[PDB]
């Protein structure tokens, strides 16, 4: 089938950093992958259909005849219903399988926009920043370490008071470059509206499915039996049956259980996207007290305000995942132990250099 | 089939950790890899079942509309008992397939919870606690060799029983951060929550199966033959039987061998993951006696107090399984000389030297 | 089928140059594979005809005459209408899959002739191109540093605006063989050909694919049945059906849906070709902004002027991709401070050598 | 067929200790191996059975009502014999390939035994032993080369029968640790239980494989022909053959031959599970002549006294396999010209030094 | 088919060493590959047999009552002649493959044997009688080189004649270890019963093979046509055929070709076997005259005596094949000028120096 290697090319599995989130990851193997498993099941390996269309044709038929008669309805799918002529028309059974790779071509479409409008931008974004943070661990520990060290030199205001504002608003541990960055990205609207596009798009194709399955389906759903004519054109002039009553569908059961699972599966998916979507209404602040202290994390929690809606949300959110690397899976995630005005300050100190890794 | 791609995709066997325990990697292989085994066997391979159904027509039926009789009961799988008309439905055989399937992808929720929700903070914890303890073997023969080599210059309390306060009370014998660290990890609970998860999910499922099996199977367990009617709609007005009786289940064994399988199986399984479960449920202290001589081991075996259901509980199991990879892999493990109040030390001791490494 | 070989062989995915736009190569890859994927799925996989012809024969026919009349009208698709004797031909039924695949083959010659009359020249241009610019870093904070070392120990026209001109001409701040090669390319129009022949070509074979389905099909679109003649030769002089009415085709909605897909998809593709043809249309001063204080980059710059379409313009075209490949992925990239006449020239210098690299 | 998937996936062929001897490796190949080899051959490649069941229905009946003769009697094996009604069941030929893949996958049970409870434990010990070990090569020859350059220079007591006593019992001629950890082992019997507990487990299953063999085959083994009856419910109230005698088993040959293969592999691989059993029940003795003499392989040598079942003999019998590896695949194996109280103490010496290596 | 696995698995073409001879290498490939070849040509490919028997039914006969016939009789071939009773079976027809099979598993045992009883020691012999022989170069080239700078220097018996006796037998010229080396190995006689069993096995197999060839075939070798009953039991009271003629074998031409063959191909294989064996029964001088003036090939050349059947013959046997490896492909090999009593040994030792190899 087409299933495998749709799925072999497709939704398959810089030189470092991660450009999707694990929950954007799980959204997009469980909405595309979705029909293509379906239609596989449906189609090949456990039901062997053979002929999807069963007729009850006269005894005076031969086996060719018989044939024509089975092989002349599945292509017209229509019900003569006595109630005037009123044929209605069979036809989601022939496109279900039509139906369900469409729907899985079309829940790609987000994907590529994702990877072709807003990862190099990001990715740009994400090397550049990280380049700088990777510069603040030997600004604190190799910079500052003459602090706890002339403090048992002397006494309280002068040496660790006075001293704090000499030192902190120094040149050497100032970052201008990244703060007007920072200032000037958090400006921007461009790569806010591709996260917001890449999930709005994914709900309306889901109420796509929803209105197709609701229309077009749930009609004929308990529909198994219908009466063709084959006497409608060149075949009129002959002496048969002019109904040929009781064309049975033979995979009614795989068509419920498809559709139903086709339901349940986006059913359930819905509220995942709302929550990622709501994720980017909200300033992050989980674990701003340590940030505040050290000399580069500080630029990060200091323009936190007004609209969360600007390009920086999107970058911390982004730079959030990718913090545990190799060299800032370091320290940083190790400060779990200062989380719990003279003594905090330096405890936060004989910690730092605890960890003074060479 | 589809069983032997989803086996090759999921279930399929840093750099260097092991998350996870041996009997853990048994109980989710034969837990999800049975089901797909059991498809695979019962609509493949050996038994070639042709169709599952085979019905007893009249002479007078040609081939056509025998084939029409014989496909249009097995998608209606409906019982017309003379006992009103109470027509029951036999659909677990047409089901088997589907449930064995939804089992499958069931039963491997609870390993992808474990691997999105707990991998990343045990690693961490895990890497920072092992690079802290791998340092504590040039602390006790590169420190401490001064010792017995002083003991043979005097005599008693002053050369064996006094310097072992000033010296293993010193600024190069003592780990404060790891201390802080295991004691800040004591208090937290999230961590051994995603484990009692993992494990209680696998126990619902498993209740689930039995209801299932006992619910739907159990009653068509020894029924193989069934009447039907095709007479049922626009066939009625036909001359030929009402009553197609005896349609006969040819897969009855199958259906039957896989019921006994699958209820034999899980029945086998359930204690295991109550063992693992009950593996929480107590301090191990089997090597506590040599742990508390070694200067970094000793905060292990010292925090061993109060309710055991802790992250340091859990740090401290998988901890022994990665405790003998390629350095702890050495002296900790020979260390098997000392497990039979002057003379026991320097034994402790003249074995320490021993193994010298270099 | 041999779809999945075609695919593979052809549309299948120096050393580090960028030689293709991404929009050119999502044009090719759905221009090509298109046909490709509607002639695996029409015939074979889901939909398998069989036989795509199905004939009334007479009961008095036994089962080798009837295949002989079933498989003598297949080859010979002649509607033999009453109303003298107009036998309308039904032939793109039978020739579909040979239009499929000579429409796969025709859409991969302009790929073909870029590859081959384009791609080394320039090539070789870029390669040279790239090699001119990478010097121009050490030309601009290695060279003029001495600008505002100097503009501290004096005060304004004789540091900040006599110096610009002793500097900025000066033997080490000319890149005289870059200017010549640009001038040179600018009056070259052999490699524009080579791109507008290669939309043209798109854009005339888009055409002839609509004149072929508007002609041959929508014709033979609404016609399932067609009356045939077996008498027309040495087999008149027998006693059988003379007009052997209604001849089914069996396929007729897999051609309907495969005419339908194939206008939708072309109609869809037609305005990024058109795009891309007016792509060359201007010249691009979206960075030139920032282009013209660089020493190098200022003769980029510079040399627009006149008619849009040089070779020049098709240069930078393919310069601007690759311009952020690992090198030039730098502070040019991260000078997107300097998007907002003697504040704004010092300020553009400090944020220079801020990014200084090692 | 799962066969060859089976013998893929299990019974396929540290870094570089061998952990497992040859003979267990040949008992495991055959004993694993054999069962999947006999369903491969038995219900695939040579023979195609197609129907195992082959029935004599009057002529009067279709063609779907012999295949619903033929179907609904392969599923319900039971013999009406006229001698009450005692309907004797003929389901071991059903049953043939379930018995062979459960007794395959029986027979693997063992090797996962030894691989998770042994295999770690002795792989530390040989590692520590080996790594011992290997040093007693510059300690009888860059130690006491020093006799016979000093017997030269003297005569008999003191210089070849009094330094005997001064040298050996030397600091630098002692292994202290690995004495202790001899001693220690030989008092564990943990690793033993392993062993004697693999090889019972296979001595167990081939008893059960022999009661499974006399108690079910061996009665239906000469039988061919059953008489049935299909009017056993439904069908009574009909007008046919209440018995349809001489159904015939078309695969009898397959089932004899399967039965008398299976009864003869085992019967030959019994006496070699006992030959390894028996291995440990006695010292080793073989080379110990020469083992006494060299340093460090005193020791090994030494502790050979009480029962044989203790831990230093499967040390002992794992280690004589892996000493010629590299390094003691030397001097040690080409000391076989020692094999035949002044002359034989000395002649030993220059042959040591002969082999010197470098 | 299985013949293309067995063949893919068994017979498949330390770390240099030749362990087989090219002579035995061809006998294994050619004893062990050709009943796989049989057995793949004679039941697949180009001879699709279908069924291997054909009857002749009466006419009243059904299509499955033909089909009963006609598979009740594969399985109990007799031939049921009028001549008492004496009801003579065909049951090679049916084992021919099952015999096939069997002795290319058979043919494998001798394989088996030498690689697991005799590899390993024969390495270890060959390792060290290479590297000890790998010494002799610099030993008659960088040693003996000032005899002819010496010759120069004085006349005949004091410089040519009586120097030869204080220079060979030398210290440095002596191989001690070498010469006990050999001794000991030539009194061993364990590893030539291997080879002597790996030849009489195969001896012994091809004489069964010769026995079961004429016992069970050449009498069922002109025999087609055989007439079976089929009222031998509970069909013996039924008014149909009781002696059921002419039921024919489809594929003798298969069975008489490849008895032929399997006979032509060992009788033409039984010579070099003996050959092989008879490689053992003589001492090889052939280039003894080189191997006697050389210092360390002095001693192979040195003890040849006695009888033939020892270790060291094997020895020299696969010396003579590895010695051309990479370091021995040299002089030595090029000292074929040299086989053609004052000159002889100049020009002997002239021509040593001018492949100097440095």
Same mark, same amino acid.
């Given at each position: 089938?087409?299933?495998? #290697? ?18 954007? &990851? ?9 029909? +293509? ?37 599945? @292509? ?6 006595? @109630? ?20 899985? =071509? ?19 974004? +994400? ?40 030192? &902190? ?12 960055? +920072?200032?000037?990205?958090? &400006? ?55 109904? %040929?009553?009781?064309?049975?569908? #033979?995979? +009614? ?15 359930? =998916? ?23 202290? %050290? ?15 600007? @390009? ?6 982004? %730079? &959030? ?30 910690? %730092?250099?605890?960890? =003074?890794?060479?």
């Amino acid at each position: 089938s087409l299933a495998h #290697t749709a799925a072999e090319y497709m939704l398959s599995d810089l030189k470092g950093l991660r450009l999707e989130l694990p929950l954007d &990851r799980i959204v997009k193997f469980v909405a595309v992958g979705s029909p +293509l498993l379906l239609m596989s099941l449906a189609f090949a390996q456990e039901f062997s259909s053979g002929s999807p269309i069963s007729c009850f044709s006269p005894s005076n038929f031969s086996i060719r005849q018989a044939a024509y008669v089975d092989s002349s309805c599945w @292509d017209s799918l229509l019900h003569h219903k006595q @109630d005037q002529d009123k044929m209605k028309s069979l036809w989601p059974h022939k496109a279900l399988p039509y139906s369900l790779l469409a729907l899985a =071509l079309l829940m790609y479409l987000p994907v590529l926009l994702w990877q072709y409008a807003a990862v190099p931008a990001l990715s740009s974004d +994400l090397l550049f920043i990280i380049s700088e943070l990777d510069k603040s661990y030997n600004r604190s520990i190799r910079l500052v370490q003459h602090m706890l060290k002339i403090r048992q030199k002397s006494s309280d205001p002068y040496v660790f008071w006075n001293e704090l504002e000499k030192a &902190r608003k120094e040149r050497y541990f100032e970052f201008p470059l990244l703060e007007r960055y +920072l200032a000037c990205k958090q &400006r921007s609207h461009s790569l806010v509206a591709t996260y917001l596009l890449r999930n709005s798009l994914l709900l309306i194709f889901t109420s796509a499915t929803y209105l197709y399955l609701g229309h077009f389906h749930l009609d004929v759903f308990f529909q198994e039996e219908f009466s063709c004519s084959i006497k409608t054109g060149l075949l009129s002039d002959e002496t048969h049956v002019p109904n %040929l009553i009781t064309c049975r569908l #033979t995979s +009614l059961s795989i068509f419920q259980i498809v559709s139903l699972s086709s339901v349940a599966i986006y059913t359930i =998916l819905v509220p995942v996207i709302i929550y990622n979507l709501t994720r980017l209404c909200r300033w992050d602040k989980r674990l701003l007290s340590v940030y505040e202290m %050290l000399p580069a994390f500080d630029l990060l929690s200091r323009k936190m305000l007004g609209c969360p809606i600007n @390009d920086l949300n999107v970058i911390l959110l982004f %730079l &959030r995942a990718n913090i545990s690397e190799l060299i800032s899976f370091s320290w940083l995630s190790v400060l779990c132990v200062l989380k719990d005005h003279n003594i905090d300050t330096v405890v936060d100190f004989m910690t %730092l250099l605890a960890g =003074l890794e060479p």
